Ligand binder design. Structure first.
Ligand SMILES: CC(C)C(=O)Nc1nnc(S(N)(=O)=O)s1
Ligand SMILES: [Zn+2]
Length: 257
């Protein structure tokens, strides 16, 4: 199975998922001086007031919080998007040390972690259909740097001990993802892909310029998770990030000057 190790990591994924070498792969380095301000871009509309979180799960490659996506409860619209995108789940990518962990980079800078809020276009009816469409998904990416704690992240951090190994899940109701968002919704956007297999080229990426700060204690709890299932040799879930991929024939647009 694919993973992040020497023998099954990102450099191997193309063998099972040949689109890994495709024309719109993610993540990418965001060269801030080359991204063009696009005044036609609209402000992002993040409507999370009615979000219904359901469960938190260790899937062997990250941990994810899943939401009820059977109704327009927590939706993303505006920005570069046409139509309405329902929040399905969020998860993180992080490093073994604070100097790596993000998937996107900014002028080659790596952040300690990156949060992905994954949404799918309601015109396609379900996420499985959406993944087969070039505009099927919108992933809101938020960088994490280490400094002050993020209070809205603590409820997530405190339950991670109950999902240490692959396959574990827990009830995770009444979590408000608005507590994970930075002040500014200034963003970069570009057409890309899922960053884990199957690497489908179905995503409009919306990457916020402003990171959130999390504390060393919060990220250290991420690093206690395990890639392995219970009973297997313990392998810390760290460095679950795909490196930046070739930009190829793509322009990154900025919502801000
Ligand atoms: C629910 C399912 C289709 C899903 O969300 N799959 C993802 N695969 N990579 C993602 S990422 N790291 O680009 O946000 S999301
Ligand atoms: Zn992700």
């Amino acid at each position: 199975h694919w993973g992040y190790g020497k023998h099954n990591g990102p450099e191997h994924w193309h063998k099972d998922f040949p689109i890994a070498k495709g024309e719109r792969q993610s993540p990418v380095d965001i060269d801030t001086h080359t991204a063009k301000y696009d005044p036609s871009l609209k402000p992002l509309s993040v409507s999370y007031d009615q979000a219904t979180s359901l469960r938190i799960l260790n899937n062997g490659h990250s941990f994810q919080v899943t939401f009820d996506d059977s109704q327009d409860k927590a939706v993303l619209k505006g920005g570069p998007l046409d139509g309405t995108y329902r929040l399905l789940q969020f998860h993180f990518h992080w490093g073994s040390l604070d100097g790596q962990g993000s998937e996107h980079t900014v002028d080659k800078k790596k952040y300690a972690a990156e949060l992905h809020l994954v949404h799918w276009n309601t015109k396609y009816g379900d996420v499985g259909k959406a993944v087969q469409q070039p505009d099927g998904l919108a992933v809101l990416g938020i960088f994490l740097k280490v400094g002050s704690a993020k209070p809205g992240l603590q409820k997530v951090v405190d339950v991670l001990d109950s999902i240490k190994t692959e396959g574990k899940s827990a009830d995770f109701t009444n979590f408000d993802p608005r507590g994970l968002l930075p002040e500014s919704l200034d963003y970069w956007t570009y057409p890309g892909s899922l960053t884990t297999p199957p690497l489908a080229e179905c995503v409009t990426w919306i990457v916020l310029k402003e990171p959130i700060s999390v504390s060393s204690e919060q990220v250290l709890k991420f690093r206690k998770l395990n890639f392995n299932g219970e009973g297997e040799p313990e392998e810390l879930m760290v460095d679950n990030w795909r490196p930046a991929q070739p930009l190829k024939n793509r322009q990154i647009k900025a919502s801000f000057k």
